[PDB]
């Protein structure tokens, strides 16, 4: 897993303000947004983090906070590794006395 995505900021907040939501720590990484075909923006956008070391710290700090928009909510690209090997069955099982 790597990077984060913000999913509740409205089109009133945009890339150069989105930067400051994380650049307030006295450093900068990188971020972006993807406009609709009418040119109207989203607020909802992608953040490329400093490193995974500070991502997990920032994830608990800014999820539920608000800056130039709504309450903001934060997600990540996650991973897939769980498999399926035949982990369940559909047959009876018991032991009764008999001679």
Swiss-Prot record:
The modification Phosphoserine is found at residues 79, 84, 96. It is found in: Cytoplasm; Nucleus; Cytoplasm, P-body; Cytoplasm, Stress granule. Methylated by HMT1. Disruption phenotype: Sensitive to boron and hydrogen peroxide. Decreases cell population growth. Disulfide bonds: none annotated. Residues 3-79 form the RRM domain. Binds to intron-containing transcripts and is involved in quality control for the export of spliced mRNAs from the nucleus. Binds to pre-mRNAs until splicing is completed or until faulty mRNAs are degraded. On correctly spliced mRNAs, GBP2 and HRB1 recruit MEX67 to allow nuclear export. On faulty mRNAs, GBP2 and HRB1 associate with the TRAMP complex that guides those pre-mRNAs to the exosome for degradation. Present with 1990 molecules/cell in log phase SD medium. This is Serine/arginine (SR)-type shuttling mRNA binding protein HRB1. The chain holds residues 262 to 358 of 454 of the full protein.
């Amino acid at each position: 897993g790597s990077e984060v995505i913000v999913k509740n900021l409205p089109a009133s907040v945009n890339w150069q303000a989105l930067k400051d939501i994380f650049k307030e720590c006295g450093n900068v990484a990188h971020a972006d947004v993807e406009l609709d075909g009418d040119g109207v923006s989203t607020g909802s956008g992608t953040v490329s983090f400093y490193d995974i070391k500070d991502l997990h710290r920032a994830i608990e700090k800014y999820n539920g906070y608000s800056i130039e928009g709504n309450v903001l909510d934060v997600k990540s690209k996650e991973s897939v590794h769980n498999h399926s090997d035949g982990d369940d069955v559909d047959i009876p099982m018991d032991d009764s006395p008999v001679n």
